[PDB]
Write a protein that binds this ligand. Structure first.
Ligand SMILES: C[C@H](CCC(=O)O)[C@H]1CC[C@H]2[C@@H]3CC[C@@H]4C[C@H](O)CC[C@]4(C)[C@H]3C[C@H](O)[C@]12C
Length: 124
């Protein structure tokens, strides 16, 4: 089962888990054979182990994450605008991505795509 209210809740849980460095909580949102794609290095992580390794690397620094607009959710997809704030290269940094989730019929994320460019990196 997969509704727009459920997909919105999942986006909220994802943001909350990033904020809490809750690695198990992040990975639990994904299907066993899900893909995560990140535009920065143009890499695709397929399946639980690769996804967990990606988020473990991504949590090495404490993250402050928040939605900056309403989630867009319909049928089997959700997209959202947000910020990730952290200390990097000795300065506070804010990255403003848009992510897209596709869900399977069971309400698990089967595909994730994260998109941000150089112009979406901001000093603190
Ligand atoms: C985890 C978020 C967002 C994940 C998502 O898009 O949903 C992303 C957004 C910005 C990303 C960081 C930007 C700077 C760094 C780039 C490195 O080469 C890998 C580690 C760092 C520290 C990255 C870690 C991680 O990948 C972040 C914090």
């Amino acid at each position: 089962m997969n509704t727009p209210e459920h997909m919105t809740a999942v986006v909220q849980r994802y943001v909350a888990a990033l904020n809490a460095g809750d690695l198990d909580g992040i990975v639990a949102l994904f299907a066993d054979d899900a893909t995560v794609y990140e535009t920065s290095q143009d890499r695709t992580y397929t399946g639980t182990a690769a996804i967990r390794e990606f988020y473990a690397n991504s949590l090495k620094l404490p993250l402050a994450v928040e939605l900056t607009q309403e989630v867009r959710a319909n049928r089997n997809e959700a997209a959202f605008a947000f910020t990730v704030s952290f200390e990097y290269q000795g300065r506070k940094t804010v990255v403003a991505p848009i992510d897209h989730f596709r869900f399977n019929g069971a309400g698990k994320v089967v595909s994730m795509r994260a998109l941000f460019g150089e112009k979406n990196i901001h000093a603190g």
